[PDB]
Amino acid sequence: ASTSDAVTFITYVQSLKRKIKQFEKQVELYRNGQRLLEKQRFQFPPSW
Amino acid sequence: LPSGKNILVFGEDGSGKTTLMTKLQGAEHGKKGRGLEYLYLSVHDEDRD
């Protein structure tokens, strides 16, 4: 409701928009890593 | 992938179901003898090699 709160929400939205590309890069990295760890049989750590 | 039994085509006679599953296995042979006849239904998955 407040102007400062609206500006904070807008800043959060802008940060999410800026980090959308980083999140897509992380998603691609996760997909490639899941494929590689599966293919090589590199078993995940039990606590991992 | 797991192992274990595969489709048992408890079908009819003369229809050449052996040929059908043969083409389904990449082969071409409907030459049935008598009784059962086991064919290795190959399955290659590139999801995890």
Curated annotation (Swiss-Prot), chain A:
It comes from the Eukaryota. It is found in: Cytoplasm, Cytoskeleton. Dynein heavy chains probably consist of an N-terminal stem (which binds cargo and interacts with other dynein components), and the head or motor domain. The motor contains six tandemly-linked AAA domains in the head, which form a ring. A stalk-like structure (formed by two of the coiled coil domains) protrudes between AAA 4 and AAA 5 and terminates in a microtubule-binding site. A seventh domain may also contribute to this ring; it is not clear whether the N-terminus or the C-terminus forms this extra domain. Belongs to the dynein heavy chain family. It is linked to Charcot-Marie-Tooth disease, axonal, type 2O: An axonal form of Charcot-Marie-Tooth disease, a disorder of the peripheral nervous system, characterized by progressive weakness and atrophy, initially of the peroneal muscles and later of the distal muscles of the arms. Charcot-Marie-Tooth disease is classified in two main groups on the basis of electrophysiologic properties and histopathology: primary peripheral demyelinating neuropathies (designated CMT1 when they are dominantly inherited) and primary peripheral axonal neuropathies (CMT2). Cortical dysplasia, complex, with other brain malformations 13: An autosomal dominant disorder characterized by global developmental delay with impaired intellectual development. Some patients show signs of peripheral neuropathy, such as abnormal gait and hyporeflexia. CDCBM13 is associated with variable neuronal migration defects resulting in cortical malformations. Homodimer. The cytoplasmic dynein 1 complex consists of two catalytic heavy chains (HCs) and a number of non-catalytic subunits presented by intermediate chains (ICs), light intermediate chains (LICs) and light chains (LCs); the composition seems to vary in respect to the IC, LIC and LC composition. The heavy chain homodimer serves as a scaffold for the probable homodimeric assembly of the respective non-catalytic subunits. The ICs and LICs bind directly to the HC dimer and dynein LCs assemble on the IC dimer. Interacts with DYNC1LI1; DYNC1LI1 and DYNC1LI2 bind mutually exclusive to DYNC1H1. Cytoplasmic dynein 1 acts as a motor for the intracellular retrograde motility of vesicles and organelles along microtubules. Dynein has ATPase activity; the force-producing power stroke is thought to occur on release of ADP. Plays a role in mitotic spindle assembly and metaphase plate congression. This is Cytoplasmic dynein 1 heavy chain 1. The gene is DYNC1H1.
Swiss-Prot record, chain B:
ATP binds at G11, E12, D13, G14, S15, G16, K17, T18. It comes from the Eukaryota. It is found in: Cytoplasm, Cytoskeleton. Acts as one of several non-catalytic accessory components of the cytoplasmic dynein 1 complex that are thought to be involved in linking dynein to cargos and to adapter proteins that regulate dynein function. Cytoplasmic dynein 1 acts as a motor for the intracellular retrograde motility of vesicles and organelles along microtubules. May play a role in binding dynein to membranous organelles or chromosomes. Homodimer. The cytoplasmic dynein 1 complex consists of two catalytic heavy chains (HCs) and a number of non-catalytic subunits presented by intermediate chains (ICs), light intermediate chains (LICs) and light chains (LCs); the composition seems to vary in respect to the IC, LIC and LC composition. The heavy chain homodimer serves as a scaffold for the probable homodimeric assembly of the respective non-catalytic subunits. The ICs and LICs bind directly to the HC dimer and the LCs assemble on the IC dimer. Interacts with DYNC1H1; DYNC1LI1 and DYNC1LI2 bind mutually exclusive to DYNC1H. Belongs to the dynein light intermediate chain family. This is Cytoplasmic dynein 1 light intermediate chain 2. It comes from Homo sapiens. The lineage of its organism: Eukaryota, Metazoa, Chordata, Craniata, Vertebrata. The gene is DYNC1LI2. The chain holds residues 51 to 99 of 492 of the full protein.
